[PDB]
Design a protein around this ligand. Structure first.
Ligand SMILES: Nc1ncnc2c1ncn2[C@@H]1O[C@H](COP(=O)(O)OP(=O)(O)OP(=O)(O)O)[C@@H](O)[C@H]1O
Ligand SMILES: Nc1ncnc2c1ncn2[C@@H]1O[C@H](COP(=O)(O)OP(=O)(O)OP(=O)(O)O)[C@@H](O)[C@H]1O
Ligand SMILES: [K+]
Ligand SMILES: [K+]
Ligand SMILES: [Mg+2]
Ligand SMILES: [Mg+2]
Lengths: 527, 527, 75
């Protein structure tokens, strides 16, 4: 209903291209090992310093609405590349700018831009097939460290710590990046089963040094219900006292009367016992209690289906652990004595539940729970001096984690834009259906040299000469922009994940070739 | 109430024609196989790229209120054409602009524009009769694929997938378009009775690979009331246990004591049973449960009228399914053992209820029930790399389904604007009553060349020469604007639904010939 | 580079191939081919080339010594 302004043809296309060019010019200065950073003003507090392409793209919106349409479309390109790959957003931005520019240049009266877009998509399918032919799988941890080093802007300590994390918790294990309070990066490996619920009352401490509850070879009592009565807690304590064995009660809550009994027996006679709340929220509580029961070889009490009561407790429905550590804010069970076969069947149940979930929230819960059963999790604390430096480093650590996961998934290709340069002869063998598809294939052929050219231009050299020498060279040779030398790139560890490259190219090509079919732009009149 | 500006005669008509011309110029760039796209800025997020004429029309409003009146009238033309036919909105827009322009040019002191409008409508009736004479019914699935391909801007894959859907679920079956998460379009055929209610308890899972409940040759217990007591659930379980047969309960809800009994008997002794909530939200829920009762051969318990009781359940009161899958979010019943004549009677009851339906929302529910009872539904998932591409493609897929349904309903004619071109000799034989009616007939006669001329102009050639060559050629010969050649259009599959053509012409003609009768325009003074 | 740029090709690649070529080989920008320039008659007067270089170098290298610019305030 609002009044609109309608622009036609080449003027509207040039305004949208101005928006695309401004955003991609801001993004392109961050590409490669000699890329620079972008400072983005925040409404609150300190500005943000970043080398991340989608972060730069998302922070830019233009007053002119025709320019802002092109800026929003390349924002979509960078966001989609970040969503499905976690890396390569700058490459996708510069590819999208190249395709938009070449498509806008090739529009005349006789051109059919929809068929040009068909030719563009056919060329991208050919390039993706050639990239999959060129890809090789990751086999060594050295390749892992090289991928993580390249994706972290040449930082070898980040690559080494990510490779160590994947050596310790597995290549598909749970790795989590968070803030460090020190100057240096730290890797913490959380083994066993550790959850973020501490002890319930501050009267179960037997070790002064950490103000912590310390037991070894202890019974574990699992409860899906709150333990508030005498009759629901006394027989388990009788079993624990008749065996001279410590007891760890993991329940929904132990409050009031059972808590009073526990603290009275702990303080007066010296009964070894501790009470921890049940981690989780809702069905995750029941799932994690069940998993602790399989891992310790115990049984969950007070449940919906089997309905085991806390009055008839046996010595065989209490789990056994080799060590338990309880602190103020967390607890951890170590060396659970559960049946190993039941642990493997529960793990397979977790994997088959992963295979049918797609909400990306309970998927992370299932990954957490699988990691707790199998090998533990890894936490990378990112060190630094200030919050701005820590955040800038965490962007690259997240990029390197995502790229390493991608390289474990789909393999590796040559870095430095060389993998798209070696796909040009695949395009040279295509037979286009008509002239418009030939135009589209040639657009993609010219666009394939753009990442290597941008990396070389950011290094202060003539990018066209670098790309020409790479093309004239043997297939293993490419430009090391950091060293400024033509090297064997696999031997020097300058490699990229295949999935990142194909994702960036496909995401750029679809949106940019849709944009180049436009003839009329309708905007709202700014009030 | 507010202050008004009043304009008279030719100046007001010129301003209204400026509004009409602006909207039609924006819409007309999208017409034909060489049409281009329009980018519409959205208030939120990404802009919308479209080739749909009514979408372009509805997005344009003008600050000048005199121009905005003409813009809203051609918006009405496009919206009415989309509501009746679902396609041909660009054709309707350009026809309306042509009629408005010719009628505005033919207004003098002695002219009677109301009688000119009467001549216009008489000419349109003659053209519609000639179109119905020229129409031929659709007999082959090849014609289905050709219609869907033409309506989807030459996309042969969309035509093939729509033809496959109409092969599998019928030409009058239920076909729904939704988003795909992949690159490519997918066709999913849902057969039998599948509804979006999963299991009530996770403990019913007996197949871990899909985390789902799988049963073969199972009893079905259907209740219109909630099952919550022991006595309402025990006898059916006793019948299921005595017959050595799985039980599937479909109820309003299963909670409380009955759910506890179900999960206890499932976990302890391994009783084959599963409980599912009933689909629907009222009378539709009762109708769907009744439909499942006829489909499986069972009876609905706890209904309002017959009032069957869950205490006295007979084995013949339970339906029989050959197979059933219950997942987390859906359930599906396969090979029900209901009486075929009862299923037929229910089907005719549903068809006659459709015949007496006047809401178009209950029509969807009745068609869904008919599809679940007879042939199943088809889901077209539209693929793409981004939301803007997916939305642009879904516009064309929806257009192709609407055009294919229209072609099934009322037949086909020559595409490319040639069907209206061949109706000119029908206008050449009319005898007008007076000079004003002769003017109106001649307006329609000039207007009948506009769609072919616009299609040829978008292809970059001289439209008038193309139209003259078509009119001088044989009746089967038209212009392939994609190939740029004069061809046999039926043989080349360039065809249109007759309903779309006549709807576009009638909807354009009524509004534009009403608009050309205006002498005074009253607008509000802009505040 | 400027002659190659005006011909619609990439000037740096052209200059690189000329510098990698034999001393008689240069780029016919009208035909878009690497040719023998004396045989094809693409030749220049020596005086014109040296005059253009000297007259550009003197003024431009004097201009690049400037720290302060004084202009009149526009009325
Ligand atoms: N020493 C190097 N020599 C040549 N190319 C290199 C070198 N180090 C990294 N590269 C290349 O630089 C690219 C990485 O650039 P950068 O990380 O700045 O952008 P991106 O991955 O496209 O985007 P973003 O990280 O912002 O999401 C990859 O193609 C990588 O192979
Ligand atoms: N190859 C072709 N040669 C000639 N005419 C063609 C060809 N393909 C399609 N057409 C014609 O183009 C017209 C379809 O144009 P288009 O779908 O852009 O507009 P529309 O149906 O009027 O409106 P909308 O789809 O926006 O609601 C039909 O008349 C169809 O017969
Ligand atoms: K970057
Ligand atoms: K159209
Ligand atoms: Mg990167
Ligand atoms: Mg159409």
């Amino acid at each position: 209903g609002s009044a609109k302004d309608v622009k036609f043809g080449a003027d509207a296309r040039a305004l949208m291209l101005q928006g695309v060019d401004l955003l991609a010019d801001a993004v392109a200065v961050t590409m490669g090992p000699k890329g620079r950073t972008v400072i983005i003003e925040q409404s609150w507090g300190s500005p943000k310093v970043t080398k991340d392409g989608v972060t730069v793209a998302k922070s830019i919106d233009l007053k002119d609405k025709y320019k802002n349409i092109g800026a929003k479309l390349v924002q979509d390109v960078a966001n989609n590349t970040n969503e499905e790959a976690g890396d390569g957003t700058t490459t996708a931005t510069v590819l999208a700018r190249s395709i938009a520019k070449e498509g806008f240049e090739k529009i005349s009266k006789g051109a059919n831009p929809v068929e040009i877009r068909r030719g563009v998509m056919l060329a991208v399918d050919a390039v993706i097939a050639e990239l999959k032919k060129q890809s090789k799988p990751v086999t060594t941890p050295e390749e892992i460290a090289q991928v993580a080093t390249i994706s972290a802007n040449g930082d070898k300590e980040i690559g080494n710590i990510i490779s160590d994390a994947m050596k310790k918790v597995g290549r598909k294990g749970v790795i989590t990046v968070k803030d460090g309070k020190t100057l240096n990066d730290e890797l913490e490996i959380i083994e066993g089963m550790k959850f973020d619920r501490g002890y319930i009352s501050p009267y179960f401490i037997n070790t002064s040094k950490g103000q912590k509850c310390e037991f070894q070879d202890a019974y574990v009592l699992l409860s899906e219900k709150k333990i508030s009565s005498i009759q629901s807690i006394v027989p388990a304590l009788e079993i624990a006292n008749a065996h001279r064995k410590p007891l760890v009660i993991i329940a929904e809550d132990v409050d009031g009367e059972a808590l009073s009994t526990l603290v009275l027996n702990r303080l007066k006679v010296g009964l070894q016992v501790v009470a921890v709340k049940a981690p989780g929220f809702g069905d995750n509580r029941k799932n994690q209690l069940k998993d602790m029961a399989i891992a310790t070889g115990g049984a969950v009490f007070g449940e919906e289906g089997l309905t085991l009561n806390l009055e008839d407790v046996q010595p065989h429905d209490l789990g056994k652990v080799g060590e338990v550590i309880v602190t103020k804010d967390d607890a951890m069970l170590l060396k659970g004595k559960g049946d190993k076969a039941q642990i493997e069947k529960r793990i397979q149940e977790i994997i088959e539940q992963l295979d049918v979930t797609t909400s990306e929230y309970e998927k992370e819960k299932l990954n957490e729970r699988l990691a707790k059963l199998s090998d533990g999790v890894a936490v990378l604390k990112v060190g630094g001096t200030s919050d701005v430096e820590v955040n800038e480093k965490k962007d690259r650590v997240t990029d390197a984690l995502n790229a390493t996961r991608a390289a474990v998934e789909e393999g590796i290709v040559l870095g430095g834009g060389c993998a798209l340069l070696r796909c040009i002869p695949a395009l040279d063998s295509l037979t286009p259906a008509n002239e418009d598809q030939k135009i589209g294939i040639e657009i993609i052929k010219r666009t394939l040299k753009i990442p290597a050219m941008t990396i070389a231009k950011n290094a202060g050299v003539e990018g066209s000469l670098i790309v020409e020498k790479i093309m004239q060279s043997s297939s293993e040779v490419g430009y090391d922009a950091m060293a400024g030398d033509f090297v064997n790139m696999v031997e020097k560890g300058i490699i990229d994940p295949t999935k990142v490259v194909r994702t960036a190219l496909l995401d750029a090509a679809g949106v940019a070739s849709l944009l180049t079919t436009a003839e009329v732009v309708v905007t709202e009149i700014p009030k």
